[PDB]
Amino acid sequence: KDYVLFDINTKAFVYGYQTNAIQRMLDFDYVCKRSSPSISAIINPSRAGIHKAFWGTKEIILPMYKTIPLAALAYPEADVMVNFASHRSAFETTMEALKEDTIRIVAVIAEGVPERQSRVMAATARKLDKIVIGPATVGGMTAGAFRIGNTAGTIENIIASKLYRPGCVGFVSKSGGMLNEAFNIISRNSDGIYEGVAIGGDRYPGSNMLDHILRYERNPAIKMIACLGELGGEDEYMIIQALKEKKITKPLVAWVTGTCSPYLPASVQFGHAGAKANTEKETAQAKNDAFRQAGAYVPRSFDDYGEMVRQVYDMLLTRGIVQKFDEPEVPRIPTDYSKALATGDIRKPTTFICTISDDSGEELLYAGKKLSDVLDRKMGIGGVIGLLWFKKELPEYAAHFIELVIQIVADHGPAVSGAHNAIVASCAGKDLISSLCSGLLTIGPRFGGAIDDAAREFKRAQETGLAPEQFVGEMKKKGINIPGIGHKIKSVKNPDKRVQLLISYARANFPSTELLNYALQVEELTTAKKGNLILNVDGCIGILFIDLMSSCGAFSKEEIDEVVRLGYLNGLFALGRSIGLIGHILDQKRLGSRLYRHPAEDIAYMMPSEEEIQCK
């Protein structure tokens, strides 16, 4: 019981939101034919909630807790914690898990944990009869029962190394990557591992190799012990002393890496924090020699490790210590979609097309132009709209016209429909965005819509060849006021400044103003009836926008008709009037304005009678 670290009933917490590691653990549980997942909960310090993962092809939900005590109280059956905290958090989180009465094993994955912190974790573990695997390890595994996080990599590797079923080998290493290579070596030269553990490469581990070797010595299922050490520190001398004191009776295969060291400078610090021979005793040579002399099976080099494994396994087969079992059913999990797509195994059709922007690359593109080029060239807001809406690099006069229109339509006081609705929502204590959309949703045929109608009606008259008099006459016959014509106060003698600013700019800077010249002929006729029948702001924008497009030269008659039809002009009004809408919402917020209720006397209540509401 004490010798068993993990079994098929082991339940664990995964500390840290490591979705791939979580999936790897579940995938192993599935291929091992486990009744339940090996994970009771995830500990996510940023967030409590749920996490969805696969159980084969079936999706399951795992609970997710902010703290170790909250998870432990909810899942007391979970006695293992897989700790993916960084080297900056590994100590505090391991110490907290070790203080929990229900947790027995903590696997510390982080590399770069101080030696002092590891010694304090190791001593805390020993005092409380608990186990710390790591720091700086992948963990380990019990074949066919449980895996620590990423131990033994892909499901393909688990299958190829026959890790879904136990063997007779008890394995322990310092290196994590070499633990996976060893799983492959051992499966090819024996019935495979029963259990494998990497203690990490730190000078002061949470648990020494001997701790695990002593558990393998007590386990009846294990008939063979195999270990892979390295230069630096005196850990392997605990094994050699135990081997000498007859504490390890099972045959032990042993190899210590770092035979390169005497050929190279004495100053060379190797990969693992603890891989540096300070004394001669700490060298790979002194260790391998002391292992040979203690009665362990030591190969000539790492190349003949598997062969020594093969020799020791064959000896157990002859003596009958190990019996030859039947290969269980080879398990199967479908390929992950993202792998199939990344390798080009599959092709997947796109649902959407996007021709205006691309955030996929090294740099954001607006209509194929890099954002840094848009800004280095001072294209301005008008230029950015040219790219994103018309897919054009507009000339300077066109981009400035767009920016002029935005300033001119920014606001027209609080009384208009849009500003009025935005103010009411703001007075109802709504946030800026809700209040803005409440205002924007009034923009249509009567508020902002005369821009499109003027562009539409004037373009058609001028195109179809109608003389201004004929257009004025036709519209009067149909009983339709000309869109873009008329003002309540402004007239020929008293002009609207917004109009004059727009017209003076186009006359001075537009290459062509053909629709404007026609519009001004129509205006001479309407002002001959009533002086206030001037070309208003909405008319001016729609008409000059057709002239801007005709001046660009890159738009056909059809393209221009499409621009009017699709409501690009309603968008320009919406974008500009957003400024004043946001302004009015914020203004009511600064003023601390109260809830609005329309005055009762401004409403004529005209209820239908009892007779009027009857069905007959």
Ligand X SMILES: CC(C)(COP(=O)(O)OP(=O)(O)OC[C@H]1O[C@@H](n2cnc3c(N)ncnc32)[C@H](O)[C@@H]1OP(=O)(O)O)[C@@H](O)C(=O)NCCC(=O)NCCS
Among positions 104-133, residues that touch a second copy (CB under 8 A) are none
Name the minimum Å distance from CB 478 to ligand X: 11
Determine if 433 is a binding residue for a second copy (CB under 8 A).
yes
- Tokens for 252, please give them: 């032990």
Distance of CA 318 to the CA centre of its chain: 56
Could you give the string, one character per residue 516-555, with x where binding to a second copy holds by CB under 8 A and - elsewhere?
Answer: ------------------------------------xxx-
- The interface partner of residue 595, options being ligand X, a second copy, none and the CB cut-off 5 to 8 Å by kind, is a second copy
- Give the bridge partners for 54, in sequence order: 59
Could you give the string, one character per residue 472-501, with x where binding to ligand X holds by CB under 6 A and - elsewhere?
Answer: ----x----xx--xx---------------
Determine if 454 is a binding residue for ligand X (CB under 6 A).
no
Determine if 461 is a binding residue for ligand X (CB under 6 A).
no
Alpha helices in 137-248 (DSSP H): 155-160, 177-189, 209-218, 236-244
Alpha helices in 141-231 (DSSP H): 155-160, 177-189, 209-218
Which listed residue (264, 330, 415, 508) binds a second copy by CB under 8 A?
415
Determine if 50 is a binding residue for a second copy (CB under 8 A).
yes
The footprint of a second copy on residues 551-590 (CB under 8 A) is: 552-554, 562, 566-568, 570-571, 574-575, 578-580, 582-590
- The interface partner of residue 530, options being a second copy, ligand X, none and the CB cut-off 5 to 8 Å by kind, is ligand X
**Sign of torsion over alpha carbons 260, 263, 266, 268:** negative
The footprint of a second copy on residues 585-614 (CB under 8 A) is: 585-593, 595-610, 612-614
Q: Which residues are part of a known binding site? A: 86, 88-89, 109, 136, 391, 476, 482, 485, 529-530, 568
Determine if 424 is a binding residue for a second copy (CB under 8 A).
yes
Name the minimum Å distance from CB 383 to a second copy: 11
**Which residue lies nearer to ligand X by CB, 342 or 467?**
467
Which listed residue (73, 260, 341, 480) binds a second copy by CB under 8 A?
341
**The dihedral formed by the CA atoms of 92, 93, 95 and 99, expressed in degrees to the nearest 10:** 130
CA distance 21 to 116: 28
196, 140 contact by CB (below 8 A): yes
Return the closest-CA partner of residue 131 out of 313, 6, 43: 6
- Tokens for 215, please give them: 């558990």
Per-residue 3-state assignment (H helix, E strand, C coil) for 448-483? ECHHHHHHHHHHHHHHCCCCHHHHHHHHHHCCCCCC
Which listed residue (530, 557, 565, 594) binds ligand X by CB under 6 A?
530
**Which residue lies nearer to ligand X by CB, 224 or 455?**
455
Which listed residue (12, 423, 533, 585) binds ligand X by CB under 6 A?
533
**Which residue lies nearer to ligand X by CB, 208 or 536?**
536
Name the minimum Å distance from CB 308 to a second copy: 40
Q: Residues 507, 510, 512, CA angle at the centre, nearest 5°?
A: 95
Determine if 427 is a binding residue for a second copy (CB under 8 A).
yes
The footprint of ligand X on residues 197-216 (CB under 6 A) is: none
Determine if 337 is a binding residue for a second copy (CB under 8 A).
yes
The footprint of ligand X on residues 509-528 (CB under 6 A) is: 526
Cβ-based neighbour number of residue 98 at 10 Å: 22
Residue 87 annotated among the catalytic residues of the structure:
no
CA distance 358 to 320: 68
Length of the chain: 616
**Which residue lies nearer to ligand X by CB, 241 or 532?**
532
Q: Which residues are part of a known binding site for succinate? A: 391, 568
483, 453 contact by CB (below 8 A): yes
Q: Give me the catalytic one of 51, 87, 212, 272.
A: 272
458, 514 contact by CB (below 8 A): no
Could you give the string, one character per residue 347-376, with x where binding to a second copy holds by CB under 8 A and - elsewhere?
Answer: xxxxxxxxxxxx-x----x-xxx-------
Name the minimum Å distance from CB 489 to a second copy: 11
**Which residue lies nearer to a second copy by CB, 267 or 338?**
338
> Which stretch, 261-269, 275-283, 437-445, 519-527, contacts a second copy (CB under 8 A)?
437-445
**Which residue lies nearer to ligand X by CB, 306 or 486?**
486
400, 568 contact by CB (below 8 A): no
Beta strands 193-198 and 169-173: pairing type?
parallel
CA distance 333 to 316: 34
CA distance 588 to 320: 90
- The interface partner of residue 482, options being a second copy, ligand X, none and the CB cut-off 5 to 8 Å by kind, is ligand X
**Sign of torsion over alpha carbons 176, 180, 181, 186:** positive
Determine if 446 is a binding residue for a second copy (CB under 8 A).
yes
Distance of CA 85 to the CA centre of its chain: 19
166, 149 contact by CB (below 8 A): no
- Tokens for 477, please give them: 């016959």
DSSP summary character for residue 518? H
CA distance 261 to 277: 8
Determine if 22 is a binding residue for ligand X (CB under 6 A).
no
Name the minimum Å distance from CB 19 to a second copy: 10
CA distance 223 to 526: 107
Cβ-based neighbour number of residue 431 at 10 Å: 11
Number of residues counted as binding a second copy (CB under 8 A): 126
Determine if 330 is a binding residue for a second copy (CB under 8 A).
no
Determine if 536 is a binding residue for ligand X (CB under 6 A).
no
The footprint of a second copy on residues 58-87 (CB under 8 A) is: 59, 61
- E strands within 33-116? 39-43, 49-55, 58-65, 80-83, 105-108
CA distance 477 to 469: 12
Q: Which residues are part of a known binding site for CoA? A: 86, 88-89, 109, 136, 476, 482, 485, 529-530
Determine if 492 is a binding residue for a second copy (CB under 8 A).
no
- Please give the residue ranges that form the binding site for ligand X (CB under 6 A): 476, 481-482, 485-486, 526, 529-530, 533
Active site residues: 272
